Structure 1
Amino acid sequence: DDNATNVKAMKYLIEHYFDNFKVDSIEIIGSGYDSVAYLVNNEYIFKTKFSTNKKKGYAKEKAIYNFLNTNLETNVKIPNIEYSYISDELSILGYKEIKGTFLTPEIYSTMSEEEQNLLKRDIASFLRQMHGLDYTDISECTIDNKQNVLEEYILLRETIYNDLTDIEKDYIESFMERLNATTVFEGKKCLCHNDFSCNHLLLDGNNRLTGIIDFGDSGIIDEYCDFIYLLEDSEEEIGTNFGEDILRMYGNIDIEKAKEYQDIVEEYYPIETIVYGIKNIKQEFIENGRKEIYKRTYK
């Protein structure tokens, strides 16, 4: 009975690291590929990092919130860290719940054109102000996506690469050649949310943008990065036209380069999956990634 057990250990770690804090209630309310999120005392979110990753950790995430809560002028709420424990082995962040409804393609489609346009304006304006921030104070929070893929590719070569089939290697090797040819990294750098997809966007009762969660991957990176998922054409995101539109509101950006950046990210996804499986040792992720490769080599 796994989640009853998870809630108990988490209740313990919270009251152990944060002495004055007493957990009267606690529930698992969410989980991404990095963290598990707990609603505590029905007002706080405590998340903890279960994924094995060093480049994107809670040290930097806390730095980013604290930077942004200081420099952003906006009525969009973001997490505000009231509790933190950071160690290499285990990290916790605690903050008052960002209250609201999560945006979905489903919610958006039944929105009036009027509510759609103001939401798209809210999103564009939030990205514009954050991408505009002088980022001197968190200058250590730079992210090099190219360099990161290079390291992950090295990890493949040092692990399972040789036991991959030829078309799998062809796939990886084709991506690597493209990654070395593209020009999408040659552009403007700034602070990006960097995981900016529907499921992090909260709406108030008027379907207005009220909150943004999970700056867990944020850093100084390509301006293009915050449009990767807005441009995504899947069933959990609204659609490419949505991203196209927001790119137009945002202004002063090469939409074609943006599209090239998401498409490169998209090509990497099966490899990212296999890498994610290798790092955390969840072999069903290596399977999926490997199977996803075959499903694209046959266009």
Structure 2
Amino acid sequence: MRTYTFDQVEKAIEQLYPDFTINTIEISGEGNDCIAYEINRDFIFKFPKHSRGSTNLFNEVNILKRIHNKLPLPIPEVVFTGMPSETYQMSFAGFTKIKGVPLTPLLLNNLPKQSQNQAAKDLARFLSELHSINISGFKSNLVLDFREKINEDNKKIKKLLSRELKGPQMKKVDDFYRDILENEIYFKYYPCLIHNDFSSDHILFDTEKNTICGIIDFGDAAISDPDNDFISLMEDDEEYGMEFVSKILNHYKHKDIPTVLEKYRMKEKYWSFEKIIYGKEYGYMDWYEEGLNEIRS
């Protein structure tokens, strides 16, 4: 992990933008890839914390320019970009701030029932449109192969868990990667452009109008299975949960909800392995062990 001071952020922007003057800056938020800074109250700059984040910033920037003005909800416009530096593909990026507040589960369920059905229509229409974006022009770079991803993870996990479990416990992991690979329900879909982190914190809301007013955070945007954008909403408590997602699925006119449920089920179990992989990637030894712990069951 790398760090920035406010002055490092200022002078990093002024190098590439010698006329742009910063009057106010504060930290808007921080996630696993970038720290967000709010500058002159109308712009959000992400600065990457590591080479992986930088590449997700590169891809976000690429995807937003490319889908500019084609979706039925507002999204960030890229107004500033940095450049490669050492082991970062994109040193930073600055987007217009979309106004509003996260559409939390609490905020959503505190809403009159008609505003809830509204919001669920606005989400299906957004996804209906995001998922019918023609992808012929995207580099195959950006097309997530789920087969390869699984085999990539499997080898990393085989390497990692050889130091952490014996024969019997390891068989359970062996069995789980074999079952997934040999079930075509995970690989036989119609790829499209997906947001790929579509959850309550990236759905902005306007309490004065009481309607969704923005989608943010496309850093994970890629070509892939569109069901992923429903699965990321379904977790109860942490997310909207089944009933609300089901309304979205029906405004979208999904013809196979049971298969959405079956990919949520698989993605729920799989989460243990991501925590192990990313836990030992960054240095997050509190999730390496929480991943490790669930797996011994």
Q: Same fold, TM exceeding 0.5?
A: yes
Cα distance change of structure 1 residues 9 and 175 upon mapping to structure 2, 3 Å threshold: farther
The residue number in structure 2 matching 1:82 is 79
The residue number in structure 2 matching 1:147 is 148
Partners of 1:36 and 1:47 within 8 A in 2: yes
Partners of 2:272 and 2:292 within 8 A in 1: yes
Of residues 160-169 and 38-47 in structure 1, the stretch that sits farther from structure 2 once superposed is: 160-169
CA distance in 1, matches of 2:151, 2:18: 42
The residue number in structure 1 matching 2:25 is 26
Secondary structure class of the residue paired with 1:223: coil
AA aligned to 2:122 is D
Deviation per CA, 1:253-278, whole angstroms, max 9, x where unpaired? 31111111122111111110111122
Secondary structure class of the residue paired with 1:228: helix
The residue number in structure 2 matching 1:180 is 181
TM-superposed CA distance for 1:46, in Å, is: 0.3
CA distance in 1, matches of 2:77, 2:172: 42
The residue number in structure 2 matching 1:241 is 243
Cα distance change of structure 1 residues 224 and 80 upon mapping to structure 2, 3 Å threshold: same
TM-superposed CA distance for 1:20, in Å, is: 2.4
CA distance in 2, matches of 1:247, 1:55: 33
CA distance in 2, matches of 1:38, 1:189: 33
**1:39 counterpart = 2:41:** no
Paired residues for 1:170-209 under 5 Å = 170-182=171-183, 183-204=185-206, 205-209=208-212
TM-superposed CA distance for 1:39, in Å, is: 0.8
CA distance in 2, matches of 1:254, 1:137: 28
**1:230 counterpart = 2:233:** yes
CA distance in 2, matches of 1:293, 1:272: 11
TM-superposed CA distance for 1:168, in Å, is: 5.5
**1:14 counterpart = 2:26:** no
TM-superposed CA distance for 1:55, in Å, is: 10
State TM-score, norm by structure 1. 0.89
Partners of 2:124 and 2:248 within 8 A in 1: yes
The residue number in structure 2 matching 1:63 is 62
**Of 211, 215, 220, the match for 2:214:** 211
TM-superposed CA distance for 1:119, in Å, is: 0.4
Cα distance change of structure 1 residues 9 and 39 upon mapping to structure 2, 3 Å threshold: same
AA aligned to 2:131 is H
The residue number in structure 2 matching 1:267 is 269
How many residue pairs match? The answer is 289
Secondary structure class of the residue paired with 2:46: strand
TM-superposed CA distance for 1:56, in Å, is: 5.6
AA aligned to 1:243 is V
The residue number in structure 1 matching 2:116 is 116
Secondary structure class of the residue paired with 1:36: strand
AA aligned to 2:33 is D
TM-superposed CA distance for 1:287, in Å, is: 1.7
CA distance in 1, matches of 2:80, 2:54: 22
**1:101 counterpart = 2:101:** yes
CA distance in 1, matches of 2:256, 2:290: 33
Partners of 2:48 and 2:54 within 8 A in 1: no
Of residues 47-56 and 281-290 in structure 1, the stretch that sits farther from structure 2 once superposed is: 47-56
Gaps of 5+ in 1: none
- Fraction of identical pairs, as percent: 29
AA aligned to 2:32 is Y
AA aligned to 1:11 is E
TM-superposed CA distance for 1:45, in Å, is: 0.2
The residue number in structure 1 matching 2:163 is 163
Gaps of 5+ in 2: none
The residue number in structure 2 matching 1:221 is 224
AA aligned to 1:222 is D
CA RMSD in angstroms comes to: 2.2
CA distance in 1, matches of 2:115, 2:46: 31
AA aligned to 1:289 is G
Of residues 19-28 and 264-273 in structure 1, the stretch that sits farther from structure 2 once superposed is: 19-28
CA distance in 2, matches of 1:105, 1:281: 31
TM-superposed CA distance for 1:23, in Å, is: 2.1
State TM-score, norm by structure 2. 0.89
Cα distance change of structure 1 residues 280 and 60 upon mapping to structure 2, 3 Å threshold: same
Structure 1 stretches of 4+ moved >3 Å: none
